[PDB]
Amino acid sequence: TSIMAVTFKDGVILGADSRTTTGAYIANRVTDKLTRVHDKIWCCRSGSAADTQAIADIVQYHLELYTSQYGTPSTETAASVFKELCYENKDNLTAGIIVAGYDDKNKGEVYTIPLGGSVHKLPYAIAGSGSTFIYGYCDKNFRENMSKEETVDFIKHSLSQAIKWDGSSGGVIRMVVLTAAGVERLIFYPDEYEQL
Template identity: 30%
Template sequence: MPGFSFDNFQRNNFLAQSGYPAPKATSTGTTIVGCRFDGGVVIAADTRATGGDIVADKNCEKLHRISPTIWCAGAGTAADCEMVTQLMSSTLELHALSTGRKPRVVTLLTLLKQHLFKYQGHIGAYLIVAGVDPTGPRLFSIHAHGSTDVGYYLTLGSGSMAAMAVLESKWQEKLTKQEAMELCAEAIEAGIWNDLGSGSNVDMCVMEVDKPAVLHRNYRTPNVRVEKEQSYKFAKGTTAVLAEKVKPIVNVVPFDIFEETTIIKDDDKMEVDG
């Protein structure tokens, strides 16, 4: 059957009745931001993927293409963000072909909130939706339960408090494209430096009116690994040997070594495997 399977709910109840603690959800971390400027909109994200206290990927991509002029930044469960945005991309394309009009950002927002609300937060996708359409630049955010916000600048994820501090203090009306890009990059770096779930590089996507979206992969790389100050390879004999004992191996069943050669004939070709 399509859809989600909740068989693990019965498993967790059985574990609880047997005296075992139920498995806990793995916490995730991300910093994503979006900012409108005069003539377009910018979204940005860090590139660290985590599973609890483990860094699973140092350079993952959290910006998802929906259409040539509409993109999403995703926080939460990586697989949920990936699959939901792919589903919305195909659905929005079919809608545009059916109506004969260019896709609009608010249409994507409606499709997303209806889909996420249906699953009551079990799809862990927290998205910043941005793009340009015939109505102009648009910027929205949507939570896993289906609630949405609209604004000139938005941020989500575990590093959103640090990012919002930068946005609140430095955002101003009628920003230029370059100013908006630098503001978003600085907000993401605030999340990278102040949130353990965020890290590595800064990805960015710029969408302008009457222009295709431009993805800037690794727009900033503040965590480039540098050479170590000294070598940690120690010469043989550095560690003292306090005692040495050699024990012979006895009662070992003897064995022989055989070499097998197979000749395969295929028309005029001959291969020999040894």
């Protein structure tokens, strides 16, 4: 698994690979790890597929009930609901979730939630097994307030290297762009990112 979310000038972009494995066999090579919990709040999923799907479904339920009563929730609020489930059920869950959402006031925000159940607000966050191989690359190439063109290239180059070295990562690079304009789905095939 190789997942990341990067804040930029106009908002935030979430990125993921499409490989889920059962041992050394790829059970699904076209997986969507970028899950919507609210209109402009999305999450990246790593670890147990059954756990992360169950958490995201409960968060989507909580945020739907929130919107019915109080209106559009903040990214911090969504990250808090994710954390509450992850922290309180830490003994039974294996989930590494990156929470990224767009706000009109707060712009783009990224919150990473590792195994333990802690929250960390970051300009950008990398997670999954493949993220270990790109810690050096991302720290040297990341800049604040990049353009959409630059951020897509940054995630595309990072995840391509993550896929290259990690056996658990692979398939296609999926991207979700969160700005004031709306939600944009992006996809990049092996024939493109492997030769970068």
